[PDB]
From Swiss-Prot, chains A, B, C, D, E, F, G, H:
The record marks M35 as: Susceptible to oxidation. Changing E22Q: In CAA-APP; Dutch type. More effective reductant than amyloid-beta protein 40. May activate mononuclear phagocytes in the brain and elicit inflammatory responses. The chain holds residues 672 to 713 of 770 of the full protein. Changing H13R: Only 23% zinc-induced amyloid-beta protein 28 aggregation. Glycans are attached at Y10. The gene is APP. This is Amyloid-beta protein 42.
């Protein structure tokens, strides 16, 4: 099972132009909690 | 199982232009908590 | 299992132009807590 | 298991131009706590 | 706006018994990628 | 805005018993990537 | 804005018993990459 | 803004018993990379 296989990159030609404004994806006054695995117990 | 295999990089030609503004992805007044594995117990 | 294999870097030609503004990804007045493994216990 | 193998660096030709502004990724008035392994216990 | 306020801790009496087996929340052969904020650009 | 305020710790009485087995939250053969803020650019 | 204020520690009485086994949160054969802020650029 | 204020330590009475096994949070055969701020550039 390939399980998510792109297998697509032959003869690739492209170009991109990107202009971003202030605070595009910034975080202010934000609280982020992230936990993976482990044991908290209280 | 390849498990997420790109396998796509033959004859690749491209160019990019990127312009960023202030605070694109910066963090101010933000609290971030991150824990992976381990034991906290109180 | 390759487990996340890029395997894509043949005949690669590219160029990039990057312009960054102030505070692109900087942190001010921010509190970051990070812990991996270990035991805290109170 | 390769476990995160790039295996992609044949015939590589590229060039980059980077311009950075003040405080691109600097930290001011920021408190960072980092601990890996070990035992804190109070 | 309280925004997620517990406000509930008056006259609290309780006790807990916890028994854990091996590999309760451990990670083996696992790849974890985590990124908050910032700019990757390729 | 309190923004996540516990405000609950009056007359608190409790006790806990915790028994842990091997590899409760340990990591073996694991690759963890973590980045907060900053600029990678290739 | 209190921004994560516990404000709960009046008349606190408690006791804990903790028993840990081998490799509770230890790391073997593990690769951990951690970067906060700064500029890598290749 | 208090920004993470405990403000909870009045009339505190407690006791703890901790027993640890071998390799509780030790690291063997592990590679840890940590960088905060600064400029790497290649």
């Amino acid at each position: 099972d390939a399980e998510f296989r792109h297998d697509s990159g032959y003869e690739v030609h492209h170009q991109k132009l990107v202009f971003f404004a202030e605070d595009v994806g910034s975080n202010k006054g934000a609280i982020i909690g992230l936990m993976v695995g482990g044991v908290v117990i209280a």
